[PDB]
Enzyme design. Sequence first.
Site: not given
Ligand SMILES: NC(=O)c1ccc[n+]([C@@H]2O[C@H](COP(=O)([O-])OP(=O)(O)OC[C@H]3O[C@@H](n4cnc5c(N)ncnc54)[C@H](OP(=O)(O)O)[C@@H]3O)[C@@H](O)[C@H]2O)c1
Length: 319
Positions: A80, A46, A113
């Site tokens: 997006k 993504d 988006h």
């Molecule tokens: N449509 C939209 O508007 C929108 C908005 C926000 C996000 N997104 C998409 O969704 C994705 C994911 O959401 P997000 O960026 O908010 O983060 P997320 O998937 O909620 O992850 C948050 C944090 O958890 C940590 N993490 C990952 N695996 C782990 C594990 N096994 N144990 C403990 N901690 C862990 C990561 O840090 P580390 O990197 O240090 O592991 C990461 O910074 C984004 O990158 C993006 O592609 C879309």
Amino acid sequence: HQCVKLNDGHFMPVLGFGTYAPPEVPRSKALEVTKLAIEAGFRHIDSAHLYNNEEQVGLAIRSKIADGSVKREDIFYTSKLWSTFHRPELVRPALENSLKKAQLDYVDLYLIHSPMSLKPGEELSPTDENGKVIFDIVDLCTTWEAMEKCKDAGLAKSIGVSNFNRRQLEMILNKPGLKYKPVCNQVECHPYFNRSKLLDFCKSKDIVLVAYSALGSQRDKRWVDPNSPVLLEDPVLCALAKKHKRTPALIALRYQLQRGVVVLAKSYNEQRIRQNVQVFEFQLTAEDMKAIDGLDRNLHYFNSDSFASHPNYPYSDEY
Ligand SMILES: NC(=O)c1ccc[n+]([C@@H]2O[C@H](COP(=O)([O-])OP(=O)(O)OC[C@H]3O[C@@H](n4cnc5c(N)ncnc54)[C@H](OP(=O)(O)O)[C@@H]3O)[C@@H](O)[C@H]2O)c1
């Protein structure tokens, strides 16, 4: 490994890799970690124009195809359309630009988006003299028709939406002469904010709900309140992790898998990247599912007070 069939006949892997990192992180990291993700087993990637990483993510994808690890058909790549590009004549150029950046002939999925249209231009956060973000009024059905045209050109295998509510979904679904339904709606979704009713609706419409911030947001201080409860420090998620000898993250991802949610996980850490794919190795019990269902607090991690006055602002305020 597992995929779900989309309502246009294409298939979407149910675990996806989130590629967003803040601007302080060097762009090289998006290349490295995306290759690690594919090597780990992720097949759904993504990205977005906003993320300023499509060159690096695309190069990681091309690299894993060219080294023989996967074929292009193995990868499900999402981009997006950014909110400054909602006017119809801007949609296909925006996609083509993303494709030029990613060195791909097509994306598997192109999303609107966000429903909150912004002043058109190659400025991504257009701002006035006072530093306030300038809005635009755009009929998102015209945006959607331009999206449909993108699908017909073969530039996007499937098309969908992100951050839409019930009403914006129906406005697309009710559109006269509608050719392709949105295959999905990607929104914030985790045990604090489960979207059970939005989920029921989507299932009713053959629309896939896709969860972001499913591990609880990366908690950027610019957009997230640090007082908010850290999702992975939840006592119940930690309890279930000890029970299954897994991690709280793994519990949170499995929770979505078992409720028919396609789930994203961002990590720029090699070990966590490789740990997240173990979500396919175990099951939660119906009782575990209930205990996690009980965590729901309608908690939004992202604060968008600045966007509350927007006509398509998706979560209506308590006002
Ligand atoms: N449509 C939209 O508007 C929108 C908005 C926000 C996000 N997104 C998409 O969704 C994705 C994911 O959401 P997000 O960026 O908010 O983060 P997320 O998937 O909620 O992850 C948050 C944090 O958890 C940590 N993490 C990952 N695996 C782990 C594990 N096994 N144990 C403990 N901690 C862990 C990561 O840090 P580390 O990197 O240090 O592991 C990461 O910074 C984004 O990158 C993006 O592609 C879309």
